[PDB]
């Protein structure tokens, strides 16, 4: 009946001034816009239909046309920034916010969804949704004793939309909006549904992607133990954002990093650092590199948890992007570690795999590796054992490469390779 209408017939129906004819035509539009293959979004916009759809959001006496128009506009707003802008320019933001309080749950949910698409376009539309007052009624839908009494789909949509209000930078979301959202977000982060958990983690990951003050707002709400629990989930859609959030947190202060350590995160890293998904191994090694940039007692907990052999492993064999993070994690460790800690690296086997990476093209990794070598020699000097290391380096072919490096385009490489050979190998 409403299947495969032409845009021309939708227009005729919308312009009829018969509400039921307008309802049928709006449903026909909704069905066109629901097709996965090339939904005709631009044809519908060019036909002038957005302002009519927006007026239909206010027809309290015809809840079906409210729903159909909300759905049609949701799918326009799911497109490009220009398509979303057409929806915003039609006045849809305050109309959708008014539908959040609708007694019809499927209409409230459709408005939640449309607002998630609008906010997800970017910081400006996100902040415009906030300025029109969306947060209070969104949060009111979740102000229940137990989230389990809400329909699963409704809760997933609310969580996803809140995650878009937490997303994006330049600027980050308004501080007061984040503070308003965080208590509800922390409750969603303890919910049992895997999609709610994943999107809650994504939201926390966005909130911790920023200066230490933004990290602190999140950490102060006590979410780190739950993040560490979710870091062990079986579902990779959960582990991935949990790990991003943990990784972001440990870019903060040593004291913020310590909360991650105290919550038990390091015991998960044997698995993360061998995870068969290369993105997880990479992000876990990046996280490690910001932990080994910490205090000596935090390096020591890395040692105690058995993680140095895992770093030797990634350096020996991993995707090249992961090996780069591993080189950074080692340089940081050698930069801040005690002499005993740095010696331990050599005993675990760091030298050979580090040398084998001096044959790579990326000039930045070579600078990183060379910096670590110096730090390691400097620690050996304090024990008088520079030759033993020089031997080690010779026997795995490292000196060959360090020498070939004397003649490499970059000049910081030049200088570094030269000083090592002059100072330790003559």
């Amino acid at each position: 009946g409403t299947v495969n209408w032409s845009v021309e017939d939708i227009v005729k129906g919308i312009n009829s001034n018969n509400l039921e004819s307008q309802l049928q035509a709006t449903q026909a539009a909704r069905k066109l816009l629901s097709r996965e293959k090339q939904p005709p979004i631009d044809n519908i916009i060019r036909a002038g239909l957005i302002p009519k759809f927006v007026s239909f959001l206010g027809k309290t006496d015809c809840s079906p046309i409210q729903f159909e128009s909300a759905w049609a506009l949701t799918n326009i707003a799911s497109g490009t920034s220009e398509q979303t802008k057409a929806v915003v320019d039609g006045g849809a933001i305050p109309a959708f916010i008014s539908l959040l309080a609708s007694p019809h749950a499927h209409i409230s949910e459709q408005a939640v969804w449309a607002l998630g698409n609008i906010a997800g376009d970017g910081s400006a539309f996100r902040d415009l949704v906030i300025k029109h007052g969306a947060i209070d009624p969104l949060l009111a839908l979740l102000a229940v004793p137990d989230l389990s009494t809400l329909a699963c789909g409704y809760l997933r949509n609310l969580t996803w939309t809140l995650s878009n209000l937490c997303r994006n930078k330049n600027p980050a979301p308004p501080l007061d909006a984040v503070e308003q959202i965080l208590p509800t977000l922390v409750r969603l982060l303890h919910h049992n549904d895997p999609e709610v958990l994943a999107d809650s983690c994504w939201a926390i990951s966005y909130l911790t992607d920023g200066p230490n003050e933004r990290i602190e707002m999140v950490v102060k709400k006590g979410v780190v133990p739950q993040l560490v629990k979710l870091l062990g989930a079986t579902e990779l859609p959960i582990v991935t954002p949990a790990l991003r959030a943990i990784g972001n947190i440990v870019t903060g202060t040593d004291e913020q990093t310590q909360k991650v350590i105290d919550a038990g995160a390091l015991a998960v890293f044997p698995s993360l650092l061998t995870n068969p998904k290369t993105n997880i191994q990479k992000e876990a090694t990046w996280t490690m590199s910001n932990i080994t940039a910490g205090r000596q007692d935090q390096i020591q907990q890395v040692v105690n948890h058995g993680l140095v052999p895992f770093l030797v492993g990634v350096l020996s064999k991993a995707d090249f992007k992961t090996q780069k993070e591993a080189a950074w994690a080692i340089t940081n460790y050698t930069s801040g570690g005690t002499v005993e800690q740095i010696v331990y690296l050599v005993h675990c086997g760091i030298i050979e795999p580090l040398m084998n990476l001096l044959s790579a093209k990326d000039t930045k990794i070579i600078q990183v590796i060379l910096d670590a070598i110096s730090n390691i020699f400097q620690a050996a000097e304090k024990l008088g054992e520079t030759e033993k290391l020089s031997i080690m380096i010779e026997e795995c072919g490292g000196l060959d490469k360090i020498e070939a490096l004397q003649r490499h385009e970059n000049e910081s490489v030049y200088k570094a390779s030269l000083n090592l050979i002059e100072k330790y190998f003559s």
Binding site: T74, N75, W160, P241, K277, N279
Partner: peptide, 13 residues
């Protein structure tokens, strides 16, 4: 393979 958030979502049903 990398898991990523969903920026916008079309409602197909």
């Amino acid at each position: 393979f990398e898991f990523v958030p969903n920026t916008k979502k079309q409602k197909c049903g």
